[PDB]
């Protein structure tokens, strides 16, 4: 099943995964009745204010310090994937290969210099540490300082900003804190999933706050529903991994509300795909599916990063996304030590992950 | 006409249920998407939230759909919801409404036909589980309102009264009649 098919075709196909949808509440069900005073539909739903089981956070069964290793893995792994994949950004698959942190790429980078993936992630992480919550205006201001003056860049300048992200900061500069836009499907690019790890670290104790912060962080620049929901799905994957679930548990299907292309990723369709059926474009659905695929088809952090980067095309974004998942799965301590050395600002990035990890608020009750 | 002046008659004379809706909806929005909250006045956010309560919905949508009288009070309630909806960013994609229609209504849903409901139309981004009919809806007058709920869990995308849709696809698969609605603005 080709994720680029039309959503009418995908939706008819996806009926086989009706089971992955949470049931309506009693009240949403009434709102879907032809006649709410004369209900027709099953009336077994739970109350609208009640916590559904798919938001019940699994208690962390690994040691806290193992979770900490995985939280550091998620954020440092993002930057690692970023710095390796940039080498092949824009290149045709299999025309060139990368298998070490060598820099180069379109922006002629030194080894270990990361790009817009990590810069945006750092802005997001810093805004959490400052405000103690997702603060979209503060996050945008930090993004503005990165874009306009090179704050939080690996080499002093903003050099690789995505078009959708650029328009959002331009629109925010022009219209102020109440602006939202980039709602059209053209704008369903990578930039919000490639910066996701800090939200998952900060909300590691609350699936519901992960769900609420993940689409919100995306809307800072990207309001396409496929971007928002891809952040929620990745954020859930990171949560399960940071809290110690095996790859099998985390990559099995989860009950959660998702639009059909993200739902099909949740359902595991990539598990059956060959490399030449996996796309690595800047479309958020392609990127997310390729990252999941790269992690499912490798056994260690090193190999997951190299499989993703060597997909070519938007190799940068797929490796940064794979870096988040694989870093959460295998842990900071299993990232190759030579890569940590070359990675620019590696200590600062690991300490931000650690700070987010310890600041993580308690689950709501 | 104030939001409080609009459901005053739907509730006990003491209680100021518009203020209660607004407070809960503000608290939910603060937790779930604080910046979206700043786009809405007290009456906008309280009205949308009220639409999602049982007593609110069953007073509003049956009146707009012609089953009960559409009083000036219910009219101002409607107007506050839509004023709020007009501020939110567009949901541009596909959402679903799982429902069971009387046969003579399903009969009117043919490819090439047009649909326009006087009430609000609730949809959800999630694939629907129940209903003889699954209505896929593409448009972009519909707005995501889950951030006003407690758990942000149901992905409700709300379409305002008198949104017109063309029926652009239809098929029965397993036991279920699928319809495709495209908003015609």
Curated annotation (Swiss-Prot), chain A:
EC primary class: hydrolase
SUBUNIT field: Forms a stable complex with cognate effector protein Tre1-Sp.
Effect of residue 31 to E: Partially protects E.coli against cognate toxin Tre1. No longer protects E.coli
NCBIfam families reported for this sequence: ADPriboarghdlase
Cofactor(s) named in the record: Mg(2+)
Name assigned to this protein: ADP-ribosylarginine hydrolase Tri1
Gene: tri1
GO molecular function, one term: metal ion binding
Knockout mutant characteristics: A double tre1-tri1 deletion is outcompeted by wild-type cells, but not by wild-type cells missing a type 6 secretion system (T6SS).
Cofactor note: Binds 1 Mg(2+) ion per subunit.
Keywords, in A-Z order: Hydrolase, Magnesium, Metal-binding
Keyword Magnesium tagged: yes
Native organism: Serratia proteamaculans (strain 568)
Region: N-terminal extension, residue numbers: 1-64
Curated annotation (Swiss-Prot), chain B:
Top-level taxonomic group: Bacteria
Annotated catalytic residues: 97, 122, 156
Phenotype of gene-disrupted mutants: A double tre1-tri1 deletion is outcompeted by wild-type cells, but not by wild-type cells missing a type 6 secretion system (T6SS).
Region described as ART domain: 15-182
Domain TR mART core, first and last residues per copy: 14-182
Cellular location(s): Secreted; Host cytoplasm
Record family assignment: Belongs to the Arg-specific ADP-ribosyltransferase family.
Its biological purpose: Toxic component of a contact-dependent interbacterial competition system (also called effector-immunity systems). Acts by ADP-ribosylating a number of target proteins in target cells; E.coli target proteins include FtsZ, EFTu, RNase E, Fis, RL9, SucB, and LolD. FtsZ is thought to be the physiologically relevant target as it is ADP-ribosylated on a critical residue. ADP-ribosylation of FtsZ prevents formation of the FtsZ mid-cell ring and inhibits cell division. Overexpression of the whole Tre1 protein or the ART domain in E.coli is toxic; cells elongate dramatically and some undergo lysis.
Assembly information from the UniProt record: Forms a stable complex with cognate immunity protein Tri1-Sp.
Domain remark from Swiss-Prot or TrEMBL: The ART domain is toxic when expressed as a protein fragment.
Protein name: NAD(+)--protein-arginine ADP-ribosyltransferase Tre1
Phylogenetic placement of the source organism: Bacteria, Pseudomonadati, Pseudomonadota, Gammaproteobacteria, Enterobacterales
